[PDB]
Amino acid sequence: AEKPNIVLFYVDDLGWGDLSSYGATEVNTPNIDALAKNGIRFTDAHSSAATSSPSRYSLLTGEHAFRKNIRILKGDAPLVISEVQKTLPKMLQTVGYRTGIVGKWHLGLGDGNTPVNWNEKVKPGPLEVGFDYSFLIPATGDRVPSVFLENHDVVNLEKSDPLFVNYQKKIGQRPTGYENPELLKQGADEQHNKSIINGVSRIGWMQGGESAEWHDETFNIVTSDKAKQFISESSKQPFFLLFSFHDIHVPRLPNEMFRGKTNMGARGDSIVQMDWTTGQVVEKLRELNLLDNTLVIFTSDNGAVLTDGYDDEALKRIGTHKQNGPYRGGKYSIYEAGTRIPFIVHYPNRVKPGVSNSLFSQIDLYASIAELLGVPLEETEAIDSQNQLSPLFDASKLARKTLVQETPHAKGLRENSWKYIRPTEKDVAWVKAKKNIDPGTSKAPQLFDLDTDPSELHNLAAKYPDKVKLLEQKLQDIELQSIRL
Amino acid sequence: AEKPNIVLFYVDDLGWGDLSSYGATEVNTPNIDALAKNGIRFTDAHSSAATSSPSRYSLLTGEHAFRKNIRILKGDAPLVISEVQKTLPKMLQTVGYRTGIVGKWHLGLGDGNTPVNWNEKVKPGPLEVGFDYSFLIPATGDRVPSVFLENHDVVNLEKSDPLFVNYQKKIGQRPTGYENPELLKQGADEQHNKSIINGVSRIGWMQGGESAEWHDETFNIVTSDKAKQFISESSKQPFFLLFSFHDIHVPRLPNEMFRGKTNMGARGDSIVQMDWTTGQVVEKLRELNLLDNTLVIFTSDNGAVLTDGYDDEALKRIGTHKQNGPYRGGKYSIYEAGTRIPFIVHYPNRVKPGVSNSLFSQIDLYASIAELLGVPLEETEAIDSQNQLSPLFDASKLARKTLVQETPHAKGLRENSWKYIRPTEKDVAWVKAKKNIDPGTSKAPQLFDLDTDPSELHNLAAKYPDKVKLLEQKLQDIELQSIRL
Ligand SMILES: O=S(=O)(O)OC[C@H]1O[C@@H](O)[C@H](O)[C@@H](O)[C@H]1O
Ligand SMILES: O=S(=O)(O)OC[C@H]1O[C@@H](O)[C@H](O)[C@@H](O)[C@H]1O
Ligand SMILES: [Ca+2]
Ligand SMILES: [Ca+2]
Ligand SMILES: [Cl-]
Ligand SMILES: [Cl-]
Ligand SMILES: [Cl-]
Ligand SMILES: [Cl-]
Ligand SMILES: [Cl-]
């Protein structure tokens, strides 16, 4: 009653403008739009980072990812969340929640002492950082191993055909993108052209594990079934479900029933699938009469990207679609579209519909949920997570004044509508070339007023150097922070 | 010194983001960017209307186009500016200016009593509403007759092969788009598939006049040559040159030297050509040492359109390019991109470089030039044109607080960053279907705050119903205005 269920939909690479309730016209997202229409949609909400693993780290620890220098993790990275580190699911466990995760992990698995043996129990993982149940795509959809990991075991593995991966050289006898292009459903760049699983090459080589191979085009069935089973089993008790999409990350291989539903190719059709999958979970909540007393949160790990490694026509068939809305940048960028993402709260018993323009941070989910449940936080716990339950539940309330934005190549700072980008000597020309996204680095400081210049086009750094200095000093204060408030 | 030259570059359908100095990365416009770098670039400047003829009418009469119900004129429409109406070129003539126009007219030509006889002298026209010299594309590039009109005469017309046009039925023996698709340089929709001139079908049928046919791919030479001659001849005297591009209107048929300069097809290559043509006129002013004492204004008649009637791949090869920047809509729309256009002032002897965010109106060019030259205006003259010479010349000065925006299906109103759109029952679904642009009509009133919602996505009408009433009242006051101030 006083402990509502929490379901956190976490989409992969969903851009600010990829929902029809955020202005999309080339794709319809009716299931997600109903949540927004009956809840609050936020226009200035942010992931911690512009790439997956750092934003997932900050969601779960309530702490900026640079404090542990988290970057995009490889398929065999060790777990980046410590087994005694405070986490949002662990926090929820102490008040009686059953916690589950279904879908993408990308937070590392194992201790790192020795390579993960995919044929033994895989630990530590989700179950050691506060999850009671986990059903994972271990790394990313485009990184081997292309298998599911349930709790501690690879699903449907045969002792007769053990599983190994290698990210430096070919092992095993699977066809590859570079040797066998005639077997490919989509062309792939050099990073992505290794072992072929289910007609698509991945990053890295995979040996064995044939019976454990997943089937991309039925991710929507597999994950939604597991999510439905978890909810149904936990229905008599408070539960936390983190539903971690592979959509709309590459390779986009949507179920055949969504193919051609848009004129944007595989990327647009993945948005349709992603919306269907959400409806499956929402309707299960409704039919068990859990929906009005569930805090549903729908959001994204980073901003959007069209061309991310496969020849899936995402850029050729973009049409009129503005995947990042009016905002400059995208995935990997320090401009606004790197972290400014869709963010929807739906909680009928407590949250009246509205639209909030408050500067809001996913990093504050930890402390705001702790506030909702009366959980005190230690002075060293989730140090960046602020109690923002009030603007989270009420569209008229303000939230942050200041928020740091993070990428590997540069840090930035929002202060109200001011946007500051720290200069860097680092060279990231591969983002413009390969990703068709301006990463946003300049060897000069950048300052923008988003009210008049929402697309970050007119650098005001030389017009307001005192403002630049003030924002850089504020960014240093945050980098140096070590306890709460 | 006190009577500077005025050269007004007026581009066809140039979107807010189609210049590299407004953020374009898929096309470079170095000549125009140099004008912005050494002058004022405006970020909130507006044509009066979202279509050609109403915005040209308002440019020349200093009066909103709805006061005469001006709409897109077909090729044989009569002159919409009366021979005794006060006009900006007529105003300039009384102060010692030689006035010329080179390029697109689209303001009508007959007196309306009888159809224009293209084989006789064509009057009234530019010479009857304040121009001393005119070399015209009479209607639009895609409307017959595909001939030039110099002063009162069709250029290179032969009595032995007289010229006739018909917009309702086929006349003459010219091939047509519907009969002879194998002759077309580009595919055409039904409105555009009539008489073939120079390998491209047009709107309407054209008979005779073979020697007077223009050549689209040499418009850049013809118009820049005519503008260079006019400047060269009038160089010893103050002059006003209105240089009215066909670029980047359909059909986009740029000179061969610009083909392939962008990866956007014919539309992108037309932006490059348009930039070359501007440089030709700018460099002629420089060679005659007139550039420093010339007020150069570069702007556009309405917002951008990709698919406007020909299969020129404008939408298929758009790539990452945002022709309207962050703004919703485009050509034909009542949303911001309908009228929010590029606007650059270059006048080194009086105008210091800068970027201005002031709400600015092309309609105010009449009164602001009158102020610059000390010309008093009658109480019934250019009634919507306000003196805004100060923010025109100074990037630090504010201009308008209120501005009405015009389309045939609905009117709108800006008040600071508030945007109000009046409701309408009228049906313009063909804009979405044929033009891939949201025309912006809703049966309900719309109100947006552009500071937080620059893309006009969150209707605030029901949250601030008093603000709606205020702006509707301001809009009616303007509709009822009849004199100046
Ligand atoms: O959303 S993320 O998981 O952070 O994306 C990780 C990315 O790694 C990059 O190195 C690849 O080229 C991308 O294709 C993508 O896999
Ligand atoms: O810039 S404008 O002259 O207003 O464009 C006029 C437009 O009229 C429409 O009926 C045609 O489909 C367009 O192709 C275009 O010619
Ligand atoms: Ca991601
Ligand atoms: Ca136009
Ligand atoms: Cl990285
Ligand atoms: Cl990698
Ligand atoms: Cl490559
Ligand atoms: Cl019209
Ligand atoms: Cl010359």
XYZ file of C-alpha atoms in Angstrom, chain A residues 58-463:
406
model
C 24.726 5.973 -12.332
C 21.109 4.793 -12.397
C 21.944 1.973 -9.979
C 24.490 3.653 -7.697
C 23.106 7.198 -7.612
C 26.580 8.476 -8.442
C 28.137 10.114 -11.494
C 29.884 7.490 -13.580
C 33.162 9.406 -13.864
C 33.800 8.799 -10.164
C 34.705 5.252 -11.233
C 35.716 6.221 -14.810
C 33.096 3.912 -16.307
C 33.243 3.605 -20.098
C 31.514 1.402 -22.705
C 32.227 -2.132 -21.476
C 33.372 -5.018 -23.639
C 31.585 -8.365 -23.696
C 33.835 -9.863 -20.974
C 34.379 -6.834 -18.735
C 34.255 -7.558 -14.996
C 31.456 -6.238 -12.821
C 31.868 -2.499 -12.213
C 29.479 -2.402 -9.219
C 31.215 -3.569 -6.042
C 29.704 -6.371 -3.994
C 29.468 -4.025 -0.968
C 28.568 -0.877 -2.936
C 25.170 0.631 -2.101
C 22.715 0.137 -4.983
C 19.110 1.088 -5.644
C 17.890 -2.561 -5.807
C 19.780 -3.400 -2.598
C 18.125 -0.392 -1.006
C 14.762 -1.722 -2.179
C 15.554 -5.191 -0.797
C 15.982 -3.822 2.750
C 12.362 -2.617 2.749
C 10.923 -5.844 1.366
C 10.984 -5.540 -2.432
C 11.548 -8.469 -4.711
C 13.954 -7.143 -7.330
C 14.345 -8.455 -10.879
C 16.078 -7.432 -14.082
C 15.205 -8.672 -17.574
C 17.247 -7.672 -20.621
C 20.484 -5.793 -21.183
C 23.138 -5.823 -18.475
C 26.327 -4.162 -19.843
C 27.661 -3.530 -16.312
C 30.266 -6.336 -16.411
C 30.223 -9.893 -15.114
C 32.862 -11.617 -12.996
C 35.627 -10.480 -10.676
C 38.205 -9.863 -13.410
C 40.883 -12.113 -11.869
C 40.387 -14.634 -14.693
C 38.263 -14.546 -17.858
C 34.626 -15.454 -17.331
C 34.044 -19.147 -17.942
C 30.692 -19.141 -19.692
C 30.315 -22.842 -18.886
C 30.435 -22.362 -15.073
C 28.420 -20.234 -12.688
C 28.929 -16.597 -13.682
C 29.474 -14.489 -10.546
C 29.491 -11.810 -9.404
C 26.644 -10.355 -11.433
C 23.174 -8.871 -10.882
C 22.401 -11.246 -8.010
C 25.386 -9.878 -6.072
C 24.403 -6.193 -6.411
C 20.818 -6.429 -5.219
C 18.767 -8.444 -7.729
C 16.875 -11.567 -6.645
C 16.189 -12.588 -10.273
C 17.968 -11.788 -13.527
C 17.513 -12.742 -17.172
C 20.208 -10.968 -19.155
C 21.596 -10.114 -22.508
C 25.042 -10.069 -20.829
C 26.886 -7.386 -22.815
C 25.095 -5.726 -25.756
C 23.052 -7.087 -28.618
C 25.999 -6.553 -30.964
C 28.689 -8.084 -28.684
C 29.297 -11.814 -28.280
C 28.320 -14.011 -26.491
C 24.882 -14.062 -28.141
C 23.327 -16.063 -25.307
C 20.999 -15.456 -22.366
C 22.252 -15.559 -18.765
C 19.610 -16.510 -16.190
C 20.774 -15.726 -12.670
C 24.159 -17.506 -12.675
C 23.822 -19.851 -15.686
C 23.829 -19.536 -19.476
C 20.430 -20.698 -20.744
C 20.249 -23.930 -22.801
C 23.996 -24.600 -22.734
C 25.160 -28.152 -23.563
C 28.159 -29.618 -21.763
C 28.817 -31.411 -25.068
C 29.316 -28.011 -26.807
C 31.021 -25.594 -24.392
C 31.047 -21.849 -25.064
C 34.006 -19.487 -25.470
C 34.428 -15.926 -26.726
C 37.480 -14.018 -27.888
C 37.614 -10.313 -28.722
C 41.104 -10.311 -30.294
C 41.262 -13.258 -32.689
C 39.038 -15.819 -34.331
C 38.251 -18.994 -32.395
C 35.787 -21.692 -33.350
C 34.366 -22.427 -36.796
C 31.378 -20.068 -37.069
C 31.166 -18.108 -40.335
C 32.114 -14.450 -40.055
C 31.113 -11.164 -41.618
C 34.499 -10.711 -43.276
C 34.745 -14.233 -44.724
C 31.058 -14.864 -45.550
C 29.248 -11.639 -46.550
C 26.725 -13.697 -48.499
C 25.291 -14.959 -45.199
C 24.538 -11.514 -43.737
C 21.069 -10.060 -43.178
C 22.725 -6.621 -42.952
C 26.144 -5.357 -43.886
C 28.476 -4.478 -41.029
C 31.553 -2.318 -40.502
C 34.936 -3.723 -39.435
C 34.233 -3.579 -35.698
C 30.986 -5.521 -36.234
C 31.922 -8.118 -38.867
C 33.120 -11.081 -36.769
C 31.214 -14.240 -35.743
C 27.807 -14.614 -37.381
C 24.935 -15.613 -35.107
C 21.417 -15.833 -36.601
C 22.537 -14.254 -39.891
C 24.203 -11.170 -38.379
C 27.842 -10.667 -37.434
C 28.785 -9.317 -33.995
C 31.729 -7.695 -32.206
C 34.086 -10.496 -31.185
C 34.261 -14.203 -31.983
C 32.087 -16.896 -30.455
C 32.933 -20.606 -30.278
C 30.500 -23.322 -29.284
C 27.310 -22.717 -27.353
C 25.112 -23.490 -30.355
C 22.084 -24.579 -28.334
C 22.390 -21.380 -26.272
C 22.254 -19.015 -29.272
C 19.528 -16.437 -28.904
C 17.160 -15.451 -31.725
C 17.104 -11.664 -32.161
C 13.751 -11.410 -33.894
C 12.043 -13.050 -30.858
C 13.629 -10.877 -28.146
C 10.221 -9.208 -27.783
C 8.580 -12.556 -26.944
C 11.377 -13.837 -24.726
C 11.855 -10.725 -22.635
C 8.179 -9.851 -22.291
C 7.373 -13.420 -21.214
C 10.093 -13.340 -18.542
C 8.886 -9.943 -17.367
C 5.294 -11.191 -17.208
C 6.366 -14.279 -15.245
C 8.326 -12.152 -12.749
C 5.409 -9.768 -12.143
C 2.907 -12.612 -11.830
C 5.044 -14.438 -9.270
C 5.776 -11.310 -7.226
C 2.205 -9.977 -7.459
C 1.310 -10.540 -3.765
C 4.356 -8.511 -2.684
C 6.124 -5.229 -3.533
C 8.472 -5.725 -6.477
C 11.031 -3.794 -8.529
C 11.368 -4.671 -12.214
C 14.159 -3.101 -14.276
C 13.196 -3.897 -17.869
C 16.295 -3.220 -19.897
C 15.525 -3.141 -23.611
C 17.819 -4.172 -26.376
C 15.683 -1.941 -28.629
C 16.536 0.297 -30.261
C 20.278 -0.601 -30.247
C 22.035 -2.192 -33.244
C 21.627 -4.665 -34.742
C 17.964 -3.736 -35.125
C 16.339 -7.058 -35.968
C 12.671 -6.573 -35.043
C 10.134 -9.359 -35.020
C 8.734 -9.833 -38.517
C 5.319 -8.569 -37.381
C 6.769 -5.034 -36.990
C 8.751 -4.956 -40.257
C 7.443 -2.306 -42.606
C 5.211 -0.732 -39.959
C 7.217 2.482 -40.571
C 8.925 3.860 -43.677
C 12.190 4.243 -41.721
C 13.524 0.708 -42.035
C 14.763 -1.492 -39.208
C 15.419 1.384 -36.780
C 11.891 2.779 -37.040
C 10.390 -0.699 -36.916
C 12.375 -1.335 -33.716
C 10.674 1.668 -32.149
C 7.328 -0.013 -32.941
C 8.476 -3.284 -31.355
C 9.784 -1.443 -28.320
C 6.330 0.143 -27.892
C 4.551 -3.240 -28.265
C 6.839 -4.775 -25.650
C 6.000 -1.994 -23.201
C 2.297 -2.574 -23.792
C 2.716 -6.261 -22.984
C 4.196 -5.396 -19.589
C 1.713 -2.576 -18.923
C -1.280 -4.752 -19.741
C -0.038 -7.515 -17.435
C 0.148 -4.931 -14.649
C -3.405 -3.820 -15.468
C -4.989 -7.277 -15.639
C -3.555 -8.215 -12.197
C -4.882 -4.854 -10.893
C -1.430 -3.551 -10.067
C -1.252 -0.581 -12.450
C -2.703 2.222 -10.312
C -0.320 1.365 -7.440
C 2.768 0.933 -9.623
C 5.328 3.664 -10.127
C 6.136 3.180 -13.831
C 9.192 5.046 -15.128
C 9.958 4.997 -18.858
C 13.273 6.423 -20.040
C 16.491 5.864 -22.015
C 20.181 5.233 -21.340
C 21.502 7.824 -23.828
C 20.517 9.849 -26.872
C 19.920 8.626 -30.400
C 22.134 7.401 -33.222
C 21.251 6.499 -36.801
C 24.381 4.816 -38.264
C 25.978 2.749 -35.471
C 27.743 -0.078 -37.315
C 25.264 -1.885 -39.577
C 23.916 -1.069 -43.038
C 20.319 -0.880 -41.879
C 19.332 2.261 -43.889
C 18.712 4.221 -40.685
C 20.149 7.408 -42.189
C 19.039 6.792 -45.784
C 15.393 6.338 -44.803
C 15.237 8.880 -41.925
C 12.757 11.006 -43.905
C 11.335 13.900 -41.848
C 11.967 12.160 -38.548
C 13.887 14.184 -35.914
C 15.187 11.433 -33.621
C 16.762 14.018 -31.249
C 13.996 16.588 -31.582
C 15.437 20.114 -31.703
C 18.558 19.205 -29.764
C 22.048 19.086 -31.207
C 24.173 15.954 -30.901
C 23.057 12.448 -30.086
C 24.671 9.286 -28.771
C 28.309 9.923 -27.740
C 27.834 13.745 -27.796
C 28.355 16.376 -25.085
C 25.668 18.470 -26.762
C 22.189 18.263 -25.224
C 20.910 15.309 -27.269
C 23.623 13.125 -25.756
C 21.769 12.991 -22.441
C 18.428 14.782 -22.971
C 16.129 11.790 -23.303
C 12.465 10.828 -22.926
C 11.423 10.488 -19.296
C 7.872 9.558 -18.297
C 6.384 8.925 -14.843
C 3.109 7.024 -14.550
C 1.673 6.350 -11.113
C -2.099 6.850 -11.097
C -2.686 6.686 -7.316
C -0.230 9.558 -6.706
C 0.729 11.428 -9.916
C -1.633 13.756 -11.806
C -1.015 14.102 -15.565
C 1.161 16.969 -16.749
C 4.271 18.101 -18.609
C 7.331 19.191 -16.634
C 10.118 21.455 -17.866
C 12.157 20.958 -14.706
C 15.837 20.097 -15.124
C 15.722 16.480 -14.030
C 18.355 13.768 -13.601
C 18.025 9.980 -13.654
C 20.824 9.997 -11.039
C 18.212 11.273 -8.536
C 15.945 8.216 -8.884
C 17.884 6.527 -6.075
C 17.419 9.287 -3.477
C 13.913 10.198 -4.597
C 12.782 6.595 -4.240
C 14.527 6.367 -0.868
C 12.482 9.424 0.126
C 9.290 7.774 -1.112
C 9.935 4.773 1.140
C 11.386 6.526 4.212
C 14.877 5.065 3.739
C 17.612 7.269 5.263
C 20.799 7.467 3.212
C 24.336 7.391 4.584
C 26.656 10.340 4.144
C 28.699 8.312 1.635
C 25.678 6.777 -0.136
C 24.562 7.682 -3.680
C 26.359 10.942 -3.165
C 25.065 12.640 -6.311
C 21.458 11.437 -5.921
C 19.167 14.214 -4.698
C 15.724 13.947 -3.121
C 13.619 15.109 -6.065
C 10.448 13.139 -5.326
C 8.443 16.378 -5.341
C 9.099 17.384 -9.017
C 9.104 13.686 -9.967
C 5.444 13.368 -8.892
C 4.248 16.945 -9.557
C 4.749 18.630 -12.950
C 4.536 22.128 -11.393
C 7.544 21.630 -9.103
C 11.104 22.612 -9.888
C 13.958 20.129 -9.582
C 17.675 20.764 -10.172
C 19.402 24.036 -10.830
C 22.695 22.354 -11.709
C 23.487 19.078 -13.471
C 26.757 17.718 -14.828
C 26.684 16.014 -18.211
C 29.270 13.360 -19.010
C 31.009 11.811 -22.023
C 34.478 10.162 -22.281
C 35.839 13.122 -24.286
C 34.412 16.071 -22.340
C 32.321 17.059 -19.363
C 29.628 19.706 -19.383
C 27.417 21.618 -16.996
C 23.816 22.810 -17.120
C 22.792 25.702 -14.873
C 19.146 26.414 -15.563
C 19.154 27.154 -19.317
C 22.892 27.830 -19.443
C 24.998 25.073 -21.002
C 28.773 24.961 -20.532
C 31.139 22.603 -22.339
C 34.665 22.206 -21.043
C 37.458 22.408 -23.640
C 39.523 19.352 -24.452
C 42.573 18.646 -26.581
C 41.229 15.113 -27.206
C 40.466 14.191 -30.837
C 37.174 12.397 -31.585
C 36.859 12.711 -35.365
C 35.683 9.099 -35.639
C 32.331 10.150 -34.157
C 31.566 12.551 -37.026
C 32.870 10.126 -39.651
C 31.468 6.801 -38.475
C 28.492 7.912 -36.361
C 27.193 11.021 -38.209
C 27.017 12.771 -34.809
C 28.923 15.870 -33.692
C 30.591 14.745 -30.430
C 30.750 18.365 -29.368
C 34.393 18.846 -28.424
C 36.225 22.071 -29.098
C 39.611 23.168 -27.901
C 37.773 26.407 -26.844
C 35.127 26.667 -24.094
C 31.488 26.694 -25.110
C 28.602 28.465 -23.451
C 25.040 28.417 -24.731
C 21.714 29.888 -23.660
C 19.224 27.138 -24.489
C 16.247 29.525 -24.209
C 17.253 31.437 -27.333
C 19.676 28.870 -28.813
C 18.233 25.425 -27.984
C 20.306 23.779 -30.769
C 23.600 25.021 -29.238
C 24.678 27.030 -32.321
C 25.842 30.402 -30.927
C 28.820 30.123 -28.583
C 28.602 32.858 -25.954
C 31.862 31.906 -24.179
C 33.684 35.058 -25.334
C 30.682 37.252 -24.549
